[PDB]
CSV table of C-alpha atoms and ligand atoms in Angstrom, one decimal:
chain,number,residue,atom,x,y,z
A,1,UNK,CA,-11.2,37.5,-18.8
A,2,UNK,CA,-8.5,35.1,-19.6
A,3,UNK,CA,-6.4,36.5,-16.5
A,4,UNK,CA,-9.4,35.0,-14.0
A,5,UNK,CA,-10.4,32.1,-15.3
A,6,UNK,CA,-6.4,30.7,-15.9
A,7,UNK,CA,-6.7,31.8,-11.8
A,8,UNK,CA,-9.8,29.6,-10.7
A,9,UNK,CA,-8.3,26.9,-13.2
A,10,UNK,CA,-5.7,26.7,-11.2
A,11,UNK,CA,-6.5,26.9,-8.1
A,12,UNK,CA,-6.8,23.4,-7.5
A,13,UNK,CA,-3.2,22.4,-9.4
A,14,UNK,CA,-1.7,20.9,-6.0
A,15,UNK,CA,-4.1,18.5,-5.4
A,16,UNK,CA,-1.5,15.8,-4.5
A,17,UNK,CA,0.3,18.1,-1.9
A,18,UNK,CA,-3.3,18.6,-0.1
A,19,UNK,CA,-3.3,14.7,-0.2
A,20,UNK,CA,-0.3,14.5,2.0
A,21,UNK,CA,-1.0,17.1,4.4
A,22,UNK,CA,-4.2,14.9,4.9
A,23,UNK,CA,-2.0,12.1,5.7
A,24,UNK,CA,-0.1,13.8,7.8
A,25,UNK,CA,-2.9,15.4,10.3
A,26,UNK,CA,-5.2,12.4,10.2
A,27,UNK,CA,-1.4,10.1,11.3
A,28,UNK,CA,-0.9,12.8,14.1
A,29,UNK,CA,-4.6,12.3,15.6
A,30,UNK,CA,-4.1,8.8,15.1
A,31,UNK,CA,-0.4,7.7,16.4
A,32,UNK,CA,-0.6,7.9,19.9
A,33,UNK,CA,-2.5,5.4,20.3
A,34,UNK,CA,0.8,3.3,20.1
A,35,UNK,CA,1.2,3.9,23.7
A,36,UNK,CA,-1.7,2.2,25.6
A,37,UNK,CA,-0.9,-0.8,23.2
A,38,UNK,CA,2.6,-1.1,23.3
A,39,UNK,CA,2.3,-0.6,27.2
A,40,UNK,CA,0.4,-4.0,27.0
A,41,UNK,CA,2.5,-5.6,24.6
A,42,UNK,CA,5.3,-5.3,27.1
A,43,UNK,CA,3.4,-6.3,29.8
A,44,UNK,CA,2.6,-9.9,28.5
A,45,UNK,CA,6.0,-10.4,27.4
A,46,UNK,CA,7.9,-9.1,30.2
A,47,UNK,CA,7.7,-12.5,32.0
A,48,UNK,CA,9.0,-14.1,29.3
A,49,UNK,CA,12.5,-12.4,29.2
A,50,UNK,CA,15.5,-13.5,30.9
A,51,UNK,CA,15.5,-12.7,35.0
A,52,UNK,CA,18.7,-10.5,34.4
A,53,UNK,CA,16.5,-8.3,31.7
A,54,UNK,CA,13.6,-8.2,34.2
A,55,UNK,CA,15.6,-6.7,36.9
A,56,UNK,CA,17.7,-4.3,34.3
A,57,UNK,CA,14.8,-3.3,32.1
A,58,UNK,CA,13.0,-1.9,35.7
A,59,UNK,CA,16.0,-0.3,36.9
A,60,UNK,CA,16.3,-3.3,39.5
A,61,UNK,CA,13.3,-2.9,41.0
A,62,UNK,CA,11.8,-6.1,40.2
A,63,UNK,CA,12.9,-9.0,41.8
A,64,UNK,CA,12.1,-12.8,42.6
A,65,UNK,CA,8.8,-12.5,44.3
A,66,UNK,CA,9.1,-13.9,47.9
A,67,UNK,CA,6.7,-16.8,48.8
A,68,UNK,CA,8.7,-18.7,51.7
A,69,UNK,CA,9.9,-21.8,49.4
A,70,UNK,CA,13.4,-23.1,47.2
A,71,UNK,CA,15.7,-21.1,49.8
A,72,UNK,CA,19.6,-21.8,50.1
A,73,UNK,CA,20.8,-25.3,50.9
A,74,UNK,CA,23.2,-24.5,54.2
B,1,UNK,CA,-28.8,11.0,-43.4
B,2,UNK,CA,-25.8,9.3,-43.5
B,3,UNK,CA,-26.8,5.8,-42.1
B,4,UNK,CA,-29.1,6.5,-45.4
B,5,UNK,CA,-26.5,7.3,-48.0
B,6,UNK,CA,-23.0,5.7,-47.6
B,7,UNK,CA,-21.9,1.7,-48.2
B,8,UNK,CA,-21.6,-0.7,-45.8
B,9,UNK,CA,-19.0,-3.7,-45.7
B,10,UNK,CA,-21.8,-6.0,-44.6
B,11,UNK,CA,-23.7,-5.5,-47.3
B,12,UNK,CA,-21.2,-6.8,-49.7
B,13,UNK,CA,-19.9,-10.7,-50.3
B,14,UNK,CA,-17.0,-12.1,-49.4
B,15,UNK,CA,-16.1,-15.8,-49.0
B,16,UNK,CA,-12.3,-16.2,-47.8
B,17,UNK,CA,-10.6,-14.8,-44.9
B,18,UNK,CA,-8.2,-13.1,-47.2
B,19,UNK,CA,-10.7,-10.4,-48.4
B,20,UNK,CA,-11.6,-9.2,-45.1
B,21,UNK,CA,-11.0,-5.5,-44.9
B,22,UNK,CA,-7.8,-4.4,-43.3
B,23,UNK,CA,-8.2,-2.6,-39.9
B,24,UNK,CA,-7.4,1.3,-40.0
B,25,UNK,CA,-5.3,1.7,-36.6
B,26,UNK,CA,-1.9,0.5,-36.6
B,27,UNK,CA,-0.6,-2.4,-34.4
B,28,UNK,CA,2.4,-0.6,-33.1
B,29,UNK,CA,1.2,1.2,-29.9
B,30,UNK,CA,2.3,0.2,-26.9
B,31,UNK,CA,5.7,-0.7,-25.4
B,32,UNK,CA,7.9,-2.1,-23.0
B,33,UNK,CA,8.8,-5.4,-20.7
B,34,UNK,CA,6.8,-8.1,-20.2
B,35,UNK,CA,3.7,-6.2,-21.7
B,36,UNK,CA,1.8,-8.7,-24.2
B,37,UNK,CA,-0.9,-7.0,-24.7
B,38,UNK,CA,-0.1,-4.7,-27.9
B,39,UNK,CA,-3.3,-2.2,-28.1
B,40,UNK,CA,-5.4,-0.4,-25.9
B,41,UNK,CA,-7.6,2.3,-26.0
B,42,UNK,CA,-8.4,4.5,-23.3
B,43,UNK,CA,-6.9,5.4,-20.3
B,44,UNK,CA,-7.6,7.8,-17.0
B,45,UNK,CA,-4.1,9.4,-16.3
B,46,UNK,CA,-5.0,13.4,-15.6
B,47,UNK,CA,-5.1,16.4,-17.6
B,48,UNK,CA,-3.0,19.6,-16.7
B,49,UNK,CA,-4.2,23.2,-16.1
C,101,CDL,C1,-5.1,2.7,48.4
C,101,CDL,C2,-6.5,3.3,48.9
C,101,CDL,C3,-7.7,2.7,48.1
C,101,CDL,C4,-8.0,3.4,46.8
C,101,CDL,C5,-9.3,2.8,46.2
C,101,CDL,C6,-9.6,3.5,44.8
C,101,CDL,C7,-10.3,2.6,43.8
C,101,CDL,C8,-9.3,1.8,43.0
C,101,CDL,C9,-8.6,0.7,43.7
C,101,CDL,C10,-7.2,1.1,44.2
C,101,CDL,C11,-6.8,0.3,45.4
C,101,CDL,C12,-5.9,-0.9,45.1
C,101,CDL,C13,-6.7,-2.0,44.3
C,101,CDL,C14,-5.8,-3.2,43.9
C,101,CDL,C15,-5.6,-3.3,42.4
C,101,CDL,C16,-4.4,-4.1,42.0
C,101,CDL,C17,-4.5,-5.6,42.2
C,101,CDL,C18,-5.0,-6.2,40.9
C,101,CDL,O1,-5.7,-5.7,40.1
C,101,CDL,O2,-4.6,-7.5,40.8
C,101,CDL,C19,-5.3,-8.3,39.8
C,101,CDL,C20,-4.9,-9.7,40.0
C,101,CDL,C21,-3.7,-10.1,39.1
C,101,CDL,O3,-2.7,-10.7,39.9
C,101,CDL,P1,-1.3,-11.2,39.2
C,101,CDL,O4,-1.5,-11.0,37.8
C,101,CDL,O5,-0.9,-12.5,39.8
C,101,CDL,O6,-0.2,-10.1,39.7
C,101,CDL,C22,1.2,-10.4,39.6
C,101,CDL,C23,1.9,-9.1,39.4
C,101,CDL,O7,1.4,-8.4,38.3
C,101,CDL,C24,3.4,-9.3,39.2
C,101,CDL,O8,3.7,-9.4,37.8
C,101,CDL,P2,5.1,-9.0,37.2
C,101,CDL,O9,6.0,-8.6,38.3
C,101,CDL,O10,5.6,-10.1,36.3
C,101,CDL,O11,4.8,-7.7,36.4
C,101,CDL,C25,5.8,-7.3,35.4
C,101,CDL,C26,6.0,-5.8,35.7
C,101,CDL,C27,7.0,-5.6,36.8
C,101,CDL,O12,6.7,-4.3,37.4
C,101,CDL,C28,7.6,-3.7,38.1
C,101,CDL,O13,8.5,-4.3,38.7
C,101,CDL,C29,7.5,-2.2,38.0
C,101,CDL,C30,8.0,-1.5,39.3
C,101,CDL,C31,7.0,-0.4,39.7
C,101,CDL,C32,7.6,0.6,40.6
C,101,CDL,C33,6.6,1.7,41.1
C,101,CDL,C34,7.0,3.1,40.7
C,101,CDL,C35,6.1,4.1,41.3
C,101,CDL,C36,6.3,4.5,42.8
C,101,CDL,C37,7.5,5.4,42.9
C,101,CDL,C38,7.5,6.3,44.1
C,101,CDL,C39,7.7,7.8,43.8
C,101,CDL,C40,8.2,8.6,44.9
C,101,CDL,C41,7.7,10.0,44.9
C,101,CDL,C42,6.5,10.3,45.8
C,101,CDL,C43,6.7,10.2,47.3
C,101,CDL,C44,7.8,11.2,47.8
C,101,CDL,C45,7.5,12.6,47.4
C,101,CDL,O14,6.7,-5.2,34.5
C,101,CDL,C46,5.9,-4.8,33.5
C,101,CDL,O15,4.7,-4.8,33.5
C,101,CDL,C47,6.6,-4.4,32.3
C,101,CDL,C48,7.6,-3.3,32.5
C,101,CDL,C49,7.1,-1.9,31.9
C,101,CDL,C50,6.7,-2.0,30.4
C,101,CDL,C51,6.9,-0.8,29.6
C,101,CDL,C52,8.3,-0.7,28.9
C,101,CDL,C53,9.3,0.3,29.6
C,101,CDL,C54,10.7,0.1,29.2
C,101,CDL,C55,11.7,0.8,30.0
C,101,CDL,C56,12.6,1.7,29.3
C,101,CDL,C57,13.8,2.3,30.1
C,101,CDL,C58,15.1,1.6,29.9
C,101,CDL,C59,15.2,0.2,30.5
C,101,CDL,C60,16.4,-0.6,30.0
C,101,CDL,C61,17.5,-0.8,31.0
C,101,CDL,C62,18.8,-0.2,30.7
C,101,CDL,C63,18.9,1.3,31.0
C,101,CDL,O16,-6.0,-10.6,39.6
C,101,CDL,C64,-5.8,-11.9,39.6
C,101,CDL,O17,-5.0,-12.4,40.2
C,101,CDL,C65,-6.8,-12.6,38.6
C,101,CDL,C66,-8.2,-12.6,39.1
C,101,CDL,C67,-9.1,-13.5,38.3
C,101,CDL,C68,-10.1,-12.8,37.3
C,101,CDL,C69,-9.9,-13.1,35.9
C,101,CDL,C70,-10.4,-12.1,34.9
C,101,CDL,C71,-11.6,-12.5,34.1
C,101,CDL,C72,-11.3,-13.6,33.1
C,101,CDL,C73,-12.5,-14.3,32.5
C,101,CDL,C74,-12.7,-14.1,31.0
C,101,CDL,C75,-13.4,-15.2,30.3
C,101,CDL,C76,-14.8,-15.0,30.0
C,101,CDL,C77,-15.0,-14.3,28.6
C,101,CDL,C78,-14.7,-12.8,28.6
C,101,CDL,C79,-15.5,-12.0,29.5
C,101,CDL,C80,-15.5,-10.5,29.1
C,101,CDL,C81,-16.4,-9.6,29.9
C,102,CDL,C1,30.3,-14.7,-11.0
C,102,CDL,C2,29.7,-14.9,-12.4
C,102,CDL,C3,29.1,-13.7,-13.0
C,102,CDL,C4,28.4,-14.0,-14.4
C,102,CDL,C5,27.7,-12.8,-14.9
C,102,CDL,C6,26.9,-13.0,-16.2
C,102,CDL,C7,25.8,-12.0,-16.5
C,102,CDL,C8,25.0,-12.3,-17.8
C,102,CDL,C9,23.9,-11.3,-17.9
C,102,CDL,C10,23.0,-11.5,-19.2
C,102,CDL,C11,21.9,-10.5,-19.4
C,102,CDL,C12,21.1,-10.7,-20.6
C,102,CDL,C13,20.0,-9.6,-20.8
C,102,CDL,C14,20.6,-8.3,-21.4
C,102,CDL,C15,19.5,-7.2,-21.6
C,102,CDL,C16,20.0,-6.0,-22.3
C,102,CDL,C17,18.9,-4.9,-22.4
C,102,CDL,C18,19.2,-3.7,-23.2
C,102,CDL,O1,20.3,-3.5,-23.8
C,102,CDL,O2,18.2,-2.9,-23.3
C,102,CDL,C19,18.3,-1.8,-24.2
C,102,CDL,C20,17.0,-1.3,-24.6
C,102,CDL,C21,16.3,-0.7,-23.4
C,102,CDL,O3,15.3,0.3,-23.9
C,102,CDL,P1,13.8,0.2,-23.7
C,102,CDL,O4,13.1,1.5,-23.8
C,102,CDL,O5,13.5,-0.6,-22.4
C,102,CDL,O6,13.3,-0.7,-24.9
C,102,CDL,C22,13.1,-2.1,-24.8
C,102,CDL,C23,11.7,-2.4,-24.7
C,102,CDL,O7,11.2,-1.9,-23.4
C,102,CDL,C24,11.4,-3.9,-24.7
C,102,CDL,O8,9.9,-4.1,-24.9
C,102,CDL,P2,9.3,-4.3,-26.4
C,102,CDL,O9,7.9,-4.0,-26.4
C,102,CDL,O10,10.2,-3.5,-27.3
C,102,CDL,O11,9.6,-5.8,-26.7
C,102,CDL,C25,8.5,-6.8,-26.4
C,102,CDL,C26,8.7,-7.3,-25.0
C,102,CDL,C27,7.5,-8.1,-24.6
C,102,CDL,O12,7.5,-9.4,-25.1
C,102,CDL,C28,6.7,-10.3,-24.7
C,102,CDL,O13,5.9,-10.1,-23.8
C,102,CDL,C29,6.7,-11.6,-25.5
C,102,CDL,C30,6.7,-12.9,-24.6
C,102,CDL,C31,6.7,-14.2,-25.4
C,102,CDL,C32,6.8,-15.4,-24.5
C,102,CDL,C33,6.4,-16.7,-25.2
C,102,CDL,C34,6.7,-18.0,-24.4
C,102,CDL,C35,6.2,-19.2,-25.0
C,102,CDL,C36,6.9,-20.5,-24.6
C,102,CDL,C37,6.6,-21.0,-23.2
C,102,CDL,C38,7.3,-22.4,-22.9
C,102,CDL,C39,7.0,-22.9,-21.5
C,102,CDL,C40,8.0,-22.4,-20.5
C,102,CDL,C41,7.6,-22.7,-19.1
C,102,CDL,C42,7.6,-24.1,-18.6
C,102,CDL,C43,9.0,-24.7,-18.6
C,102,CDL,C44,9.3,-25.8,-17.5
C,102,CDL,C45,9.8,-25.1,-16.3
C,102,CDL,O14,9.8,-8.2,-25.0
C,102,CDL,C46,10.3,-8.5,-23.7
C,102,CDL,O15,9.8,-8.2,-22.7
C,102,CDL,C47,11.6,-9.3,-23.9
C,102,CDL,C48,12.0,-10.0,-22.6
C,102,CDL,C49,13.3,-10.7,-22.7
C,102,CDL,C50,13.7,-11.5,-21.4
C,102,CDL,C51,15.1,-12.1,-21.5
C,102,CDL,C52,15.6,-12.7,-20.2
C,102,CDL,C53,17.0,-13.2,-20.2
C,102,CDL,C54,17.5,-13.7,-18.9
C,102,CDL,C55,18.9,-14.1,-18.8
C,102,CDL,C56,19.4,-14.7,-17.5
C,102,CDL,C57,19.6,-13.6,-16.4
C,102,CDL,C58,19.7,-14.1,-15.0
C,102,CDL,C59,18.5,-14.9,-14.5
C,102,CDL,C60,18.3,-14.9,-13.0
C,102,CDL,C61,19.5,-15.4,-12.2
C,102,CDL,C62,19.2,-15.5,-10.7
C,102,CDL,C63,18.8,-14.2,-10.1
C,102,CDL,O16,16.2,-2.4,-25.0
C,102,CDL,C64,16.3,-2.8,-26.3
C,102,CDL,O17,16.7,-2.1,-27.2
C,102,CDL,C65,15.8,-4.2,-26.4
C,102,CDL,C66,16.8,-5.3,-26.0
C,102,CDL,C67,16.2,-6.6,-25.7
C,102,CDL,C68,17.1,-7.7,-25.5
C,102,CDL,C69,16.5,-9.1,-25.2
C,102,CDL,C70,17.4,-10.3,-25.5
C,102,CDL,C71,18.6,-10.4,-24.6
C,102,CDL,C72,19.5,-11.5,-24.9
C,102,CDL,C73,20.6,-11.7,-23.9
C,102,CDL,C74,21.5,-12.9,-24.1
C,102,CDL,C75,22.3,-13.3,-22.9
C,102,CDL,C76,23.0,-14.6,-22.9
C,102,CDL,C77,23.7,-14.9,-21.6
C,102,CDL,C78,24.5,-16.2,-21.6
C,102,CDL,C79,25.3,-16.4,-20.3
C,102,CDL,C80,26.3,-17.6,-20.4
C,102,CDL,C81,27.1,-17.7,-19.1
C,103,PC1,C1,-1.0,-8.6,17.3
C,103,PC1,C2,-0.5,-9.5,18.5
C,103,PC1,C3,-1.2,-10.8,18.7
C,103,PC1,C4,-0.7,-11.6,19.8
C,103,PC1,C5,-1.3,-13.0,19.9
C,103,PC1,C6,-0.4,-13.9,20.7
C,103,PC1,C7,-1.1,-14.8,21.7
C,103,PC1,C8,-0.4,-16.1,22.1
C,103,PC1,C9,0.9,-15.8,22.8
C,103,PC1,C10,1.8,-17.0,23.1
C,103,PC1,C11,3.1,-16.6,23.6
C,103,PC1,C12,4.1,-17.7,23.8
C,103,PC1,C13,5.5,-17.3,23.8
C,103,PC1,C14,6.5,-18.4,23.5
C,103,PC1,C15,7.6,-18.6,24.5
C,103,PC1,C16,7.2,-19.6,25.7
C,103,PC1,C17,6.2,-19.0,26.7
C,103,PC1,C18,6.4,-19.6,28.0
C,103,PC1,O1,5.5,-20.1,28.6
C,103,PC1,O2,7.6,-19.5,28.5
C,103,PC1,C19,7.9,-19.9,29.8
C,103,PC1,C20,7.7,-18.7,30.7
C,103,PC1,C21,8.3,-18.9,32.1
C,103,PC1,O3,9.6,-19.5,32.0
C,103,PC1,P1,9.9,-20.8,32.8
C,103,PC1,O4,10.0,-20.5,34.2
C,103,PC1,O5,9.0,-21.9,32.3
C,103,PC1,O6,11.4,-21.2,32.3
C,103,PC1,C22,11.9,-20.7,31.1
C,103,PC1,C23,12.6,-19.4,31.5
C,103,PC1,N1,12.7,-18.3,30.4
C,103,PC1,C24,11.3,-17.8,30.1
C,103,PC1,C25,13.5,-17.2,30.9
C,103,PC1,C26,13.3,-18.9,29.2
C,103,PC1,O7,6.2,-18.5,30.9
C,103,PC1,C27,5.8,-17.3,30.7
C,103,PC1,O8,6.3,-16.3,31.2
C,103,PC1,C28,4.5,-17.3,29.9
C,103,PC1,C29,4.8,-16.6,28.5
C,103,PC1,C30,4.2,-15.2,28.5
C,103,PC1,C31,4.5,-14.5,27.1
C,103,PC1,C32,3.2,-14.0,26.5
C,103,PC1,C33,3.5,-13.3,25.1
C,103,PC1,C34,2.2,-12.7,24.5
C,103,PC1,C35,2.5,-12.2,23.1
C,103,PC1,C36,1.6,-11.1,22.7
C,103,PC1,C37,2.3,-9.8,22.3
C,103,PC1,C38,1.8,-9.1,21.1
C,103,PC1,C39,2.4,-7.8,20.8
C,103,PC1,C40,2.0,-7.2,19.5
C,103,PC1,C41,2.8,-7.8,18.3
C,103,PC1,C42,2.2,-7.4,16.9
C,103,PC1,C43,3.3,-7.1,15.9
C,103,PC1,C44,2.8,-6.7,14.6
């Protein structure tokens, strides 16, 4: 019948809109990944920022590391 | 049979680039900015339901 086969025709019509709900589940599995990497990114360039941004970005608990040298000059 | 019935073009003399026969598909196809290329044939854009 006419009726069935205009059905399994189109059936497949949205093609396009399957596409995109590919991209969107396989960019769900895949986006975390962001952390581990950007975790690094920040710890290589953490030493290079300004002393003041070290101590705000940690919530001021970093601080000059203490090795018994370049004290105050009385 | 009809490779062994009709005329051919080739078959027949001509000496001056005048008396070539005239192509059958018009020049005025395609369109638009930039595009020098005037005629094509086929393309692979989709068909509907
Ligand atoms: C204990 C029992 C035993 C258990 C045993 C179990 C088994 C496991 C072991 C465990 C035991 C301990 C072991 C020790 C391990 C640690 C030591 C260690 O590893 O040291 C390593 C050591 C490294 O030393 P180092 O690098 O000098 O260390 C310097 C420090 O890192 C100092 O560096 P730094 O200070 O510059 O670091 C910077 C750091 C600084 O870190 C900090 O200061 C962080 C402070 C941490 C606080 C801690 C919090 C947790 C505690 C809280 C307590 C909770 C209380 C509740 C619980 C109690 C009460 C209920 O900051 C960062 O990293 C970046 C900040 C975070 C980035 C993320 C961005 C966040 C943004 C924030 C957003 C919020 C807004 C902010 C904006 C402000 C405005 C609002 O190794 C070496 O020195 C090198 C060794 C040489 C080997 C070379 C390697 C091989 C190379 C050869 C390769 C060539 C061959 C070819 C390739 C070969 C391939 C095969
Ligand atoms: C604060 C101060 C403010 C000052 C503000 C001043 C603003 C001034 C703005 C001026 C804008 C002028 C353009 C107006 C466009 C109007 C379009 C329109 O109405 O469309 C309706 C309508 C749109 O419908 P449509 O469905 O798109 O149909 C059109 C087709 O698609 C068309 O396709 P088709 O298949 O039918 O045709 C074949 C197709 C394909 O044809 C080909 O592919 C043939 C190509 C042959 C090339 C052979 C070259 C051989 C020689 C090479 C020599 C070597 C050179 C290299 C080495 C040299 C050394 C370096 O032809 C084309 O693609 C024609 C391309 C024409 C390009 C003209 C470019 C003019 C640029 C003016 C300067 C603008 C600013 C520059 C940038 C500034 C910095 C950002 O189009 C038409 O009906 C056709 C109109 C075509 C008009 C073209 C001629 C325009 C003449 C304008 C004169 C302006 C004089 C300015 C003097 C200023 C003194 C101060
Ligand atoms: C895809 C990422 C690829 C990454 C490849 C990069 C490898 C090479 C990195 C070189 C960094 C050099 C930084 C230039 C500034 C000078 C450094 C320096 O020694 O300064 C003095 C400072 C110490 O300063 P100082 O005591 O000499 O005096 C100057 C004081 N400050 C710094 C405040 C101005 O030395 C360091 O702390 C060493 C520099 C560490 C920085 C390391 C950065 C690594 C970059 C990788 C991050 C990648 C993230 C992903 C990005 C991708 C995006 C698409």
């Amino acid at each position: 019948s006419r009726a069935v086969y205009a059905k399994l025709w189109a059936s497949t019509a949205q093609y396009t809109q399957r596409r995109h709900y590919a991209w969107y589940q396989i960019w769900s599995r895949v986006i975390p990944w962001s952390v581990p990497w950007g975790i690094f990114a920040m710890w290589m360039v953490f030493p290079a920022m300004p002393v003041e941004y070290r101590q705000a970005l940690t919530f001021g608990i970093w601080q000059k590391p203490n090795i018994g040298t370049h004290g105050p000059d009385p | 049979l009809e490779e062994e019935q009709q005329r051919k073009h080739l078959d027949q003399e001509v000496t001056d680039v005048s008396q070539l026969v005239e192509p059958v598909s018009s020049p005025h196809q395609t369109e638009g900015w930039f595009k020098r290329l005037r005629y094509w044939h086929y393309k692979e854009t989709a068909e509907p339901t």
